[PDB]
Amino acid sequence: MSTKLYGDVNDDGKVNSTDAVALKRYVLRSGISINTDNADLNEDGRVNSTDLGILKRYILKEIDTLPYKNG
């Protein structure tokens, strides 16, 4: 029907400061349940700090493609 997300945490929109709640709970331990499927995209898990940026960069609105920018 319709799909638009990128490594969502609570399947709300995406994994960012918004889904930090679970993040903190995650970074701490792997107890909570999140769409770990496509959650991590830098072998970090979520947004250690390197991904966050881009995330908070694209998640700003670009949320749809995400300028991963390889390099």
Residue of the chain from 30, 38, 42, 62 that contacts Ca ion (CB under 5 A): 42
> Among the candidate windows 13-21, 22-30, 31-39, 60-68, which touches Ca ion by CB under 5 A?
13-21
Distance separating alpha carbons of residues 64 and 48, to the nearest angstrom: 21
Distance separating alpha carbons of residues 71 and 64, to the nearest angstrom: 20
Residue of the chain from 6, 22, 39, 51 that contacts Ca ion (CB under 5 A): 51
Annotated binding-site residue? 11: no
Q: Rounded to the nearest 10 degrees, how much is the dihedral formed by the CA atoms of 27, 47, 63, 19?
A: 30
Where does this chain bind Ca ion (CB under 5 A)?
Answer: 12-13, 19, 40, 42, 44, 51
